[PDB]
């Protein structure tokens, strides 16, 4: 559509991905052809004479920006207009440029960051990087705010930075680079006193709206450059127009004909499918304070809880668990018996082998079987390790559904990489909803290419990714194919229960082609391909029908005390007769359980008057 393509943003604080040539590649394919990078903009470890003409389009960075250890002379990061600074490098700064030079003292030369106007949060740090010229004279109080202006630590000193002075057409000699263009476009200290936000020119007659962040093209909420809080079809509103307006002349809530749903810094007509739609009209991803979610005809709401309701735990990276990055044996005492993980599940090979860097003990490989209770997972599931016994994913036996609201790396909700397990064993796994699934790097795992993932997904558009695991032509050699019963609809494993739809009959989970009926020893009956047990009180049939109901009332062939239509082991031995009186039933000419003359109120246990002592 008309919108701007987004990157996902790196998150490598200070880290070299391979070598100077491999790192340059993890930059390119990550930051090529995008404009609104959503997490960060690390441009790090570039080396001399490496083209960077693909940074001329990044027009927003919703996180901090780190330019560290860069030796190319010119970083064309110009069109950047605003650094929303949702998350800070070094927990304070939101634009860091530090130590950009090699041993030969030929580091970063010029940052032609011309159009950078506003930083919505955080200070700006700078450190030793000679050849950096002209930036040593930029005006900061315009770019940054006023309170956060007490944390920045700029420090400029260069030696070969003989770069020429900037053209006199621009104030105080303030300039990003050289030429008339590179000079600090001022919009927040030349405003008239009567203006509150952005402006252009000291004229008090052409200010900007109250919500514009960079600049404007006329004072209006429809002519901003970048919106400060929200936006809806080119309008930088401060809150999406609510659904129900209040009418003070009649006290009743009206209906707003412009009510839009506030979905993460944009106003939308309807939340996406897997997102809860609360009452305030704001799309949520996890709405539980005392209440819980439930289906409301295709749109999930979260109505009130009636006091005691089921448990929910917090995922990994949210709330409590943020200093930890996996599930190790110090943050497992929380997932005790909760059935839905609000968040996301990481399993990295740090929990088992432990580590001393963050004070984690070596989690015992058995404690992981606690997760048998998990049914719904909101975010993603990432697995890259498993105890060196288990052969199928066992602790996640009955995982019902993977919501996949937040996806690891932006596409992968289920990810099982570099594992040693004969086959998956995730047998319930109803409806993986959004995000893709990657199951690769596995040594010995073959069955998984048999399932029909095109049906397992939820919202369409998904795509599976299964390569680099034990070849099918090697598991058929060892005959590791699934049970002959399973229909051509997939089989998570060799055990005859790992099917997804049995051949003819099913025992609820275990497959059997022919359960027991009019021939067969165990007493049961089929019902829509489900082998259900009739009451055992009846006698084993050989010619005609056994029954059609769970209760013994259809046990026609019975060799015990036949309770009229029913049949029990002995005629009722404690059932109440009339008016709350204990009555033991006796046997009729056909051994049937029937009543007697109401005379003997203590039952009728004898022929006539021989059971009521006269």
């Amino acid at each position: 559509l008309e919108e701007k393509k987004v990157c996902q943003g790196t998150s490598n604080k200070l880290t070299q991905l391979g070598t100077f040539e491999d790192h340059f590649l993890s930059l390119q394919r990550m930051f090529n052809n995008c404009e609104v990078v959503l997490g960060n903009l690390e441009i790090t470890y570039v080396q001399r004479n490496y083209d960077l003409s693909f940074l001329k389009t990044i027009q927003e960075v919703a996180g901090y920006v780190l330019i560290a250890l860069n030796t190319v002379e010119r970083i064309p990061l110009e069109n950047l207009q605003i650094i929303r600074g949702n998350m800070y490098y070094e927990n304070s700064y939101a634009l860091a440029v530090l130590s950009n030079y090699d041993a030969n003292k030929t580091g970063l030369k010029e940052l032609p960051m011309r159009n950078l106007q506003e930083i919505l949060h955080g200070a700006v740090r700078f450190s030793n990087n000679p050849a950096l010229c002209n930036v040593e004279s930029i005006q900061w109080r315009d770019i940054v705010s006023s309170d956060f202006l007490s944390n920045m630590s700029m420090d400029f000193q260069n030696h070969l930075g003989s770069c020429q002075k900037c053209d006199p057409s621009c104030p105080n000699g303030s300039c990003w680079g050289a030429g008339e263009e590179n000079c600090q476009k001022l919009t927040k200290i030349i405003c008239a006193q009567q203006c509150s936000g952005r402006c252009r020119g000291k004229s008090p007659s052409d200010c900007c709206h109250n919500q514009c962040a960079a600049g404007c093209t006329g004072p209006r909420e429809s002519d901003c450059l970048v919106c400060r809080k929200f936006r809806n079809e080119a309008t930088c509103k401060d809150t999406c127009p609510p659904l129900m307006l209040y009418n003070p002349t009649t006290y009743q809530m009206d209906v707003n004909p412009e009510g839009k749903y506030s979905f993460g810094a944009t106003c939308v007509k309807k939340c996406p499918r897997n997102y809860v739609v609360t009452d305030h009209g704001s799309c949520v991803r996890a709405c539980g304070a005392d209440s819980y979610e439930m289906e409301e005809d295709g749109v999930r709401k979260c109505k009130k809880c009636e006091g005691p309701c089921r448990k929910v735990c917090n995922g990994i990276g949210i709330g409590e668990f943020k200093d930890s990055l996996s599930i190790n044996a110090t943050n497992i005492k929380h997932f005790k018996n909760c059935t839905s993980i609000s968040g996301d599940l990481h399993i990295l090979p740090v929990a088992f082998r432990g580590d001393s860097f963050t004070h984690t003990p070596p989690l015992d490989p058995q404690e992981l079987d606690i997760l048998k209770t998990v049914k719904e997972i909101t975010g993603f599931l990432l697995i890259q390790a498993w105890p060196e016994n288990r052969t199928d994913l066992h602790a996640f036996e009955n995982l019902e559904i993977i919501r996949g609201r937040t996806k690891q790396h932006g596409q992968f909700s289920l990810a099982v990489v570099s594992l040693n397990i004969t086959s998956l064993g995730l047998r319930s796994l109803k409806e993986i909803s959004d995000g893709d699934v990657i199951i690769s790097g596995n040594k010995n795992l073959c069955y998984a290419n048999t399932i029909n993932w095109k049906k397992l997904f939820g919202t369409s558009g998904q795509k599976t990714k299964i390569i680099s695991n034990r070849g099918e032509n090697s598991c058929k050699a060892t005959g590791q194919v699934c049970h002959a019963l399973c229909s051509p609809e997939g089989c998570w494993g060799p055990e005859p229960r790992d099917c997804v739809s049995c051949r003819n009959v099913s025992r609820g989970r275990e497959c059997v082609d022919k359960c027991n009926l009019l021939e067969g020893e165990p007493r049961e009956f089929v019902e829509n391909s489900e082998c259900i047990q009739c009451h055992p009180e009846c006698l084993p049939q050989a010619m005609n029908i056994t029954c059609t109901g769970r209760g013994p009332d259809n046990c026609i062939q019975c060799a015990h005390y036949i309770d009229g239509p029913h049949c029990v082991k002995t005629c009722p031995a404690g059932v109440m007769g009339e008016n709350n009186t204990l009555v033991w039933k006796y046997a009729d000419a056909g051994h049937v359980c029937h009543l007697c003359h109401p005379n003997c109120t203590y039952g009728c246990t004898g022929p006539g008057l021989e059971g009521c002592p006269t």
């Binding site: 998150s11 490598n12 604080k13 200070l14 880290t15 070299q16 991905l17 391979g18 491999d22 993890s26 394919r29 250890l69 530090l98 130590s99 090699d102 041993a103 030969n104 450190s127 030793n128 990055l325 996996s326 990295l348 090979p349 740090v350 580590d355 001393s356 860097f357 990432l382 890259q384 690891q408 790396h409 992968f412 990810a415 990489v417 570099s418 990657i438 690769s440 790097g441």
Partner: protein
């Protein structure tokens, strides 16, 4: 020639998982280089984009 990096200070040894550690002096911080096919600030996550 004098570079940024001295060997890992053993205060944060085994700092990352899938990569080799190195301590830089231009901020007194450890910043390690990962093996191939890994990402993260501690080379912990596996590269899934392949």
């Amino acid at each position: 020639v004098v570079s940024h990096f001295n060997d890992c200070p053993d205060s944060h040894t085994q700092f990352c998982f899938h990569g080799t550690c190195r301590f830089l002096v231009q901020e007194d911080k450890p910043a390690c280089v990962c093996h191939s096919g890994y990402v993260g600030a501690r080379c912990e996550h596996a590269d899934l984009l392949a």
